[PDB]
């Protein structure tokens, strides 16, 4: 019984610690506004032969 109480404490503490670590780490991950997908258009008809367009 005593060890089962200690184990319940350990299990709940582990769940809580995992959740807190998840919160703290995912606070540093990519934000929402940094998720802008970029579409670009290039005038190929204006590109000369011996030139690189970037």
């Amino acid at each position: 019984y005593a060890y089962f109480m200690v184990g319940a404490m350990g299990l709940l503490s582990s769940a809580g610690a995992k959740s807190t670590v998840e919160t703290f780490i995912s606070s540093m991950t990519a934000t929402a506004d940094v998720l802008a997908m970029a579409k670009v258009e290039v005038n190929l008809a204006a590109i000369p032969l011996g030139k690189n367009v970037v």
């Binding site: 109480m5 709940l12 769940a15």
Partner: protein, 51 residues
């Protein structure tokens, strides 16, 4: 003002339940291992007055 209420309340409910359970468990364990000293006794038997 805070387009984050739904998940805030859900998370709060989860945290409250987890913490209340852990509080009760901790109360129990403190009552447990502290009992090793709370129930002790002392029987003072004075020594023989020799010096």
């Amino acid at each position: 003002a805070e387009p984050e209420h739904d998940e805030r309340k859900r998370l709060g409910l989860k945290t409250v339940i987890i913490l209340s359970s852990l509080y009760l468990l901790s109360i129990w364990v403190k009552k447990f291992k502290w009992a090793g000293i709370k129930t002790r006794k002392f029987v003072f038997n004075p020594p023989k007055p020799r010096k």
